[PDB]
Amino acid sequence: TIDEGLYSRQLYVLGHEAMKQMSQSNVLIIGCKGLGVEIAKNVCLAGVKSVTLYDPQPTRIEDLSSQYFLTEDDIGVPRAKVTVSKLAELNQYVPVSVVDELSTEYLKNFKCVVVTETSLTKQLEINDFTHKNHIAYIAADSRGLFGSIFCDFGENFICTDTDGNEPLTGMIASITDDGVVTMLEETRHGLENGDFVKFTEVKGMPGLNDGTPRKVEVKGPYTFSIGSVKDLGSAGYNGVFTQVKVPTKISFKSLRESLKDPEYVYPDFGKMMRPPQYHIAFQALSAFADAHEGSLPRPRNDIDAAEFFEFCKKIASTLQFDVELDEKLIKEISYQARGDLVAMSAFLGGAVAQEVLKATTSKFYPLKQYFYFDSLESLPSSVTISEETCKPRGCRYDGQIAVFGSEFQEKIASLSTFLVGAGAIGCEMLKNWAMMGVATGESGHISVTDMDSIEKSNLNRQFLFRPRDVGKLKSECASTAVSIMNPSLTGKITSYQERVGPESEGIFGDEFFEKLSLVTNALDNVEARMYVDRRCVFFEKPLLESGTLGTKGNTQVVVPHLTESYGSSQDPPEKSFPICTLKNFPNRIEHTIAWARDLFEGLFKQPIDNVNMYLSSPNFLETSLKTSSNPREVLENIRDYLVTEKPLSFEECIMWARLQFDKFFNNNIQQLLFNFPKDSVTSTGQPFWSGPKRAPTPLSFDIHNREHFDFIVAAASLYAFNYGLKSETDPAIYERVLAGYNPPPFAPKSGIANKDKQELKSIADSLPPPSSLVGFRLTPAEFEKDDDSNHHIDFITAASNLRAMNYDITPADRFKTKFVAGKIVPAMCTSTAVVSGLVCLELVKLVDGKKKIEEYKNGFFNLAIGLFTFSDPIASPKMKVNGKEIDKIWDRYNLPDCTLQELIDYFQKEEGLEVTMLSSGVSLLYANFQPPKKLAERLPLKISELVEQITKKKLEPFRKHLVLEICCDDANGEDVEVPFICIKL
Amino acid sequence: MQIFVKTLTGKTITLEVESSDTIDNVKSKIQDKEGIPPDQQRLIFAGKQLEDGRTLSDYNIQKESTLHLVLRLRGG
Amino acid sequence: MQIFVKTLTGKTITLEVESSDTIDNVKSKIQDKEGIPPDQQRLIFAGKQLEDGRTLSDYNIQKESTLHLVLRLRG
Amino acid sequence: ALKRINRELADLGKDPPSSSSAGPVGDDLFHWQATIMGPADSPYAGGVFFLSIHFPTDYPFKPPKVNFTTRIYHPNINSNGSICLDILRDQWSPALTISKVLLSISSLLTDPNPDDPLVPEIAHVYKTDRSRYELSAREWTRKYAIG
Ligand SMILES: Nc1ncnc2c1ncn2[C@@H]1O[C@H](COP(=O)(O)OP(=O)(O)OP(=O)(O)O)[C@@H](O)[C@H]1O
Ligand SMILES: [Mg+2]
Ligand SMILES: [Mg+2]
Secondary structure, eight states, X not given: OOOTTTSHHHHTTSOHHHHHHHTTOEEEEEOOSHHHHHHHHHHHHHTOSEEEEEOOOBOOSGGGGTOTTOOGGGTTSBHHHHHHHHHTTTOTTSOEEEOSOOOTGGGGGXXXXXXXXXXXXXXXXXXXXXXTTTOEEEEEEEETTEEEEEEEOOTTEEESOSSOOOOOEEEEEEEOTTOEEEESTTOOOOOOTTOEEEEESOBSOGGGGSOOOEXXXXXXXXXXXXXXXXXXXXXXXSOEEEEEOOOEEEOOOOHHHHHHSOOEEOSOTTOOSSHHHHHHHHHHHHHHHHTTTSOOOOTTOHHHHHHHHHHHHHHHHHTTOOOOOOHHHHHHXXXXXXXXXXXXXXXXXXXXXXXXHHHHHTOSOOOOSEEEEEOGGGSOOSSOOSTXXXXXXXXXXXHHHHHHOHHHHHHHXXXXXXXXXXXXXXXXXXXXHHHHTTTOSSXXXXXXXXXXXXXXXXGGTOTTOOGGGTTSBHHHHHHHHHHHHOGGGTTOEEEEOOOOXXXXXXXXXXXXXXXXXXXXEOOSSHHHHHHHHHHHHHHTOOEEEEEEETTEEEEEEEOTTTBOOXXXXXXXXXXXOOHHHHHTOOOSHHHHHHHHHHHHHHHHTHHHHHHHHHHHSTTHHHHHHHHOSOHHHHHHHHHIIIIITOOSSHHHHHHHHHHHHHIIIIIHHHHHHHHSOTTOBOTTSSBSSOSSOOOOOOOOXXXXXXXXXXXXXXXXXXXXXXHTOOOOOOHHHHHHHHHTOOOOOOOOOXXXXXXXXXXXXXXXXXXXXXXXXXXXXXXXXXXXXXXXXXXXXXXXXXXXXXXXXXXXOOOOOHHXXXXXXXXXXXXXXXXXXXXXXXXXXXXXXXXXXXXOTTSOOEEEEETTTTEEEEEOOOBOOEEEETTEEEETTTOOEEEESOBHHHHHHHIXXXXXXXXXXXXXXXXXXXXXXXXXXXXXXXXXXXXXXXXHHHHTSOOOTTOOEEEEEEEEEOTTSOEEXXXXXXXXX | OEEEEEETTSOEXXXXXXXXXXXXXXXXXXXXXXXXXXXXXXXXXXXXXXXXXXXXXXXXXXTTOEEEEEOOOOOO | OEEEEEOTXXXXXXXXXXXXXXXXXXXXXXXXXXXXXXXXXXXXXXXXXXXXXXXXXXXXXXXXXXXXXXXXXXX | OHHHHHHHHHHXXXXXXXXXXXXXXXXXXXXXXXXXXXXXXXXXXXXEEEEEEEOOTTTTSSOOEEEEOSOOOOTTBOTTOOBOOSTTXXXXXXXXXXXXXXXXXXXXXXXXXXXXXXXXXXXXXXHHXXXXXXXXXXXXXXXXXXX
């Protein structure tokens, strides 16, 4: 009973069973500051049964540094009371409550307990009870640029899925008598040692088809072993194998035991000596707070730092830690004790929310057990950070001034950023910018662009939008919401509904870009990313890229004149199937789904467009005849969609659907078997239907079968929609109409000058004149997966399952069909939060203008297995041109709008290079091998005139530059690369 | 010398190399064991992304070292 | 010496070869006997796929060894 | 992209292939029109076939998109001009050039592969009644590829 209209993207990450079990779990959250509220938001969006908050502390001003559900009118009110009302709106299925008193026994009501901003003694008191009652306990902490997470799910945690990957499946060629299984040609099983697999449809070894899992010994990328199968047979041919994933038993240790000898999880292998330091530092922080009436060390205070270091040494001696304490790092932790950054809060909130989902669903591998993280490279160095500048000023940014200072706050407030896209990452980025006070100064400004509209399925991870906001524009809603969150941003956000691309350069031109400070991409396709990257490279602006997929995420930074661009690296391309496999010989459900999609498009989209275009253009016939690869099929489509097979009622639609069923599932298979009989052999004597080719069988229509009826209903409904007739749904009419059907005879054909033209003319004159049909138009069927009342996914599923029945392939349900046909990208809220946190941690580095490449970090992570990694960006390549050092990416030539001959002479004279090719856009302006007459014609013209002539289109009024790519040779004839040319118009 | 490469999807790969081997040889071995073209492979060790043209000794990679094979994601 | 090669269809082909013979020569013999192009031949012995440029001895193939021949389906 | 295309075009210009002629249409570097002469020892002998080659932005990394324009009676070519080729697919990587593709298409013209066909009826004719296939191919080339 899961609402698939809301959790559509999340179910592809977790699953039906996982969410079913998750929806019966209770979560308690202690602490409602930025980290606590972030965790609560992620949990509420995830869909647990309920959430309870406990935080009786009165609100203070500095708490607004990272709490986006608190306003300056709520000072002096308990945080839980003022946060629950706003949290209850995120998800209608997740009630949110507040408890004003916490007793130990009460903890028995909850499946998971999350603890933040609580002293260590209370944490020990809670854990001593939660450990022995089998209650998941998660404790999180965020101090300035440092963070810690601790997980304890009990001594007998059972993990059903470990890596979160789909089970591997494959087709076997042969199984020897010693269990040596071999895959088909150029196919990798991908298994590891110790895995379990089960076989099916194996010929010659029926014993392996029972279903008993067996061990796997990977002997190579294409072959593996399972052991001895002597008794079950001698050799096995063909068959399929599927991986079996077995549960794992994980044992956690209580907090009291874990303090003595922790087990760390390292987010960065470049600094493996720090977590031992942080373990002492955080305990020293807790002890210091307990020894000063719950007061953290004052920012950048030397006396407090010395006392904190004394506490650290005392703890190190007490715990018998054989580590040498690094005074600088520990005192850095002491200085930033009162810091409260929204970026760290978002990062840790995403991580902890994922851990909570793991605890409730018993899925994925959790952290075991300590996770200490820092981003100390983000501390500004171009401003004065001292005790006098980091003191609080009684404003809402105190939690950030305590780390960065007032001068860096002024630097942040003067940013002029540009955010592309307003998806989930866009919403998180806007929230972080609002909290950080970005562009709240006199010279600040924010611009956001996105052309999409809010849909129901977007509410699962885009928290700035509400069900009342469905149908509106994403940019407007996000801008309004963030203006509500931070009133200082009112009138400093501009929202556009324009798509960023080659057709929108009139708005995002030179004037727009020359005033920016950085560009942040929040897109979901590679083309737009590359376009924005090229624009940023041309204008020399920092760029921040980020991407998510299910539980995986990555973030990258592009810095002018320092690092390489986004487009200097490759990514794996999308896989497409060969046309021959899809057309006649499928062997996977994906092939049938693709074929069903093509059938849908060809039945309900293309003929309608042809008919409409014929009725619109007065002379469409000539264009169709002289342009279409198959004009006669176009004429046939027009004829049989206008006159011959035009329906007049719904019964005719049902009969048409039956006829199409016969055409596509009974006759084509008979023709194929006539061409390639089941007993046929290839040229080498081997049977034709062996291996990846499966012998099909015709389908005889049977009304009692569910799939046949589903296909008939879907096809009839879509045809009626095309012709705009009323469509019935009661099966009685379908049974009555289809009962009295007499199939025409069919016999496969064996095959065997000016007649074709005669037939074309006969068809042409049979068509009624367009004059006789004025105002009559047919509605094409535009594919739309997200709507469940249009019979699109139903038709695709029915056709795919019928074709699978033709070729003996296991059919897929509607869920998987929707996933495959719609090309849905799995998405999650936790991954979005983590990537936004990382990007905002890089943003402060960009603002400070760090000039060294060892200070920036590109991040990759996978939350399913708890993997984090960071790596420095790749420096832009250099080269030598005319005895000078030239950056390959960020350098360009600035030339006036001079003649082509003058350009060639300039290059020959200054650089000593001979120009051989000069192109602009996708046109070849000048080439060395062109005939002399053409060059003489094109030589004395200016560059702008040459471009206008070649492209046969005038330059736009707003064009202020031209980007030309030039290939030139040196004096010796050796090709030398040169940077592009920026002609100034 | 034996090294381990961990994929972003959780898979682990064992490679037999020598200190003098270049990054291109390692990428070729990874392609052989996985089919990933060398131009699309992103190897990270100790916070440094390995670049073509250099040797393992340049990155101080020793026996039982751990590398991470990562990739970029198009969603978001 | 003599070796046996078994196909996916149960056919067994006997070949007279020497331990020093290259894999390419064996594939040429298979092409002569069956007409299968060498590029499409994939020979497997003891769980290892034979590769061009090597010899049978490199794979420890000895008297009356049994190999498996699987061919690829060109697209 | 543009530099790679220009390099390939210059290379083609240096040495005339004598069996193929590919060049940009109009001035669009990413759209080419190529000509292939039918192999002498084939049913398609004495024929000129025009192909349209749309280039990919990621070239040479991504593969090109070749389509036949002249009607041809071949088992691996359908009525839309699609080509069932391997070096136009996974087998292809950024190591070969358009000249290789044109030679490969000429070879595929030289000897069809009916074991994995794209037009089942033509493959059936080719396997069963070779002479009828030869006659049909010659007639189709005569009436479509000449003139
Ligand atoms: N070229 C582009 N220019 C501007 N905005 C773009 C461009 N391409 C995509 N976007 C926007 O980027 C956002 C991508 O975010 P996301 O993919 O999470 O949302 P969605 O596509 O609406 O959702 P879903 O993929 O779940 O159906 C969307 O707002 C999309 O409109
Ligand atoms: Mg959308
Ligand atoms: Mg999207």
